Amino acid sequence: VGINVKCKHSRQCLKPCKDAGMRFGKCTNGKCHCTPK
């Protein structure tokens, strides 16, 4: 579930999550995490 991209805070993961077509986006486990609507 989600994508496989690095992150530095949290808001920087919303960019690739929203552009990938997912709804949620946050930095977790040192990586970008997204989930469906």
Swiss-Prot record:
GO cellular component: extracellular region
Cysteines engaged in disulfide bonds, as pairs: C7-C27, C13-C32, C17-C34
Expressing tissues: Expressed by the venom gland.
Annotated positions of the Lysine amide modification: K37
Subcellular localization: Secreted
Keywords of the record: Amidation, Disulfide bond, Ion channel impairing toxin, Neurotoxin, Potassium channel impairing toxin, Secreted, Signal, Toxin, Voltage-gated potassium channel impairing toxin
Coiled coil: none
Single GO molecular function: toxin activity
Additional free-text comment from the UniProt record: Negative results: has no effect on rat Kv1.4/KCNA4, Kv1.5/KCNA5, Kv4.1/KCND1 or human Kv11.1/KCNH2 and Kv3.1/KCNC1. Has no effect on bovine KCa1.1. Does not inhibit the growth of Gram-positive and Gram-negative bacteria.
Role according to the record: Blocks voltage-gated potassium channels. At 2 uM, blocks rat Kv1.1/KCNA1 and Kv1.3/KCNA3, has a strong effect on rat Kv1.2/KCNA2 and Kv1.6/KCNA6 as well as a moderate effect on Shaker IR.
Protein name according to UniProt: Potassium channel toxin alpha-KTx 3.6
Organism: Olivierus martensii
Covered range of the whole protein: 23 to 59 of 60
